[PDB]
UniProtKB/Swiss-Prot annotation:
It is found in: Cell membrane; Cell projection, Dendrite; Cell projection, Axon; Cytoplasmic vesicle. Binds lysergic acid diethylamine (LSD) in the orthosteric pocket. Bound LSD dissociates extremely slowly, with a residence time of about 221 minutes at 37 degrees Celsius. Residues 65-73, 143-159, 315-322 are extracellular. It comes from Homo sapiens. The chain holds residues 74 to 399 of 471 of the full protein. Serotonin binds at residues 82, 309. This is 5-hydroxytryptamine receptor 2A. The PDZ domain-binding motif is involved in the interaction with PATJ, CASK, APBA1, DLG1 and DLG4. Its main location: membrane.
Length: 365
């Protein structure tokens, strides 16, 4: 009746508002300009399109009693959209991890000069592959009207489509995301270990310089310190390398008594920069944790719908399907609420998201 129509109607507007907020935050804040936030904005675009088009149609179908009120030729469109955006999201997320798994493994990943157009084309390519995956739904639904209509109700009825799409769209990106998340935490655990080794090497060679009577000892210690400071090529790694090379210039000239005071000043710079480099890896893994959270939430909230759809294929004879069919009618809306959940996490964890969204609240832009 109507006591559940209101419950399923708030989800649409919450999804719309939250994802429009996310789009505005990504497109407005100058601090979010990188590949990950561009992918998140594309994800928010997909969520906003899903909430603007598919969710209200599903709501009106619910209020009409799970009956299709639109022209019969548009049903194949509806499912297509419901596949086009979600398949994007599960592949957008799967993209991000992969990118963040590989774009950080090059030894100069902590550098500036991010490839904006490269990430833009990556997003376009992910959308293109999602379009290619989603094309069969309308292509084979326009020909056969019994593939998108299951005895008067507009939903996927082809068991082959259900199985393959569940494998292709849902399970494969989920497994890829899990494996890449594990490999990402394993890889990032090594970053914080090499940095500590560089810090220890710098401390050892600074101890060596402080107590010295030779001229080439300074050269050896400064060379070892030069190798340690190189690190992930931040660019201000080279400002520390440049200062070390300045002291190395003093040593190679010959004045030992002058190089030691310089290295003392560089020691203060070294401690400051390492506490800045090791802090950068902390954010590098915090973003990974937040993205893992959003992966988990999306997958878990879309799980029951796929579980029941897979159930409805193989055991079509040895499984009761009286109330189980009605379970899908709320599992689909759990999957829809997965769209609205993401901005909540963004406001819960990412500080810039919190500030921007609070700015837009309480009678303000
Ligand atoms: C041969 C295939 C390409 C044929 O084409 C297919 C492509 C995809 C699938 C599997 N995808 C869905 O079951 N849905 C979309 C989805 C997509 C991705 C996600 F991560 C989450 C949800 C459901 C469609 C029905 N509505 C009501 C809920 C969502 C089925 C067939």
């Amino acid at each position: 009746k109507n006591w559940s129509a209101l419950l399923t109607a708030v989800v649409i507007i919450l999804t719309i508002a939250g994802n429009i907020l996310v789009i505005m935050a990504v497109s407005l804040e100058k601090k979010l300009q990188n590949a990950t936030n561009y992918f998140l904005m594309s994800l928010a675009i997909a969520d906003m399109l899903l909430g603007f088009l598919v969710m209200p149609v599903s709501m009106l179908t619910i209020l009409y009693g799970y009956r299709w009120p639109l022209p019969s030729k548009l049903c194949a469109v509806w499912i297509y959209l419901d596949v086009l955006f979600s398949t994007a999201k599960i592949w957008h997320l799967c993209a991000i991890s992969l990118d963040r798994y590989v774009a950080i493994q090059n030894p100069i990943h902590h550098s500036r000069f991010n490839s904006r157009t490269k990430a833009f084309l990556k997003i376009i390519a992910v959308w293109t592959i999602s379009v290619g995956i989603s094309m069969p739904i309308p292509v084979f639904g326009l020909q056969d009207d019994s593939k998108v209509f299951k005895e008067g109700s507009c939903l996927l009825a082809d068991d082959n489509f259900v199985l393959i799409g569940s494998f292709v769209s849902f399970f494969i990106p989920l497994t890829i995301m899990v494996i890449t998340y594990f490999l990402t935490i394993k890889s990032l655990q090594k970053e914080a270990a090499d940095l500590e080794d560089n810090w220890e090497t710098l401390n050892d060679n600074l101890k060596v310089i402080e107590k010295a009577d030779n001229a080439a000892q300074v050269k050896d210690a400064l060379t070892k310190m030069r190798a340690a400071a190189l690190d992930a090529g931040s660019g201000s790694g080279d400002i520390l390398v440049g200062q070390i090379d300045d002291a190395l210039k003093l040593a190679n000239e010959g004045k030992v008594k002058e190089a030691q005071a310089a290295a003392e000043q560089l020691k203060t710079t070294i401690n400051a920069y390492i506490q800045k480099y090791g802090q950068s890896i902390s954010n590098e893994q915090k973003a990974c944790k937040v993205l893992g959270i959003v992966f988990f939430l999306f997958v878990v909230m879309w799980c029951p719908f796929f579980i029941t759809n897979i159930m409805a294929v193989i055991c079509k004879e040895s499984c009761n399907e009286d109330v189980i069919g009605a379970l899908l009618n709320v599992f689909v809306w759990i999957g829809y609420l997965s769209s609205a959940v993401n901005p909540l996490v963004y406001t819960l964890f990412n500080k810039t998201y919190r500030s921007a969204f609070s700015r837009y609240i309480q009678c303000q832009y």
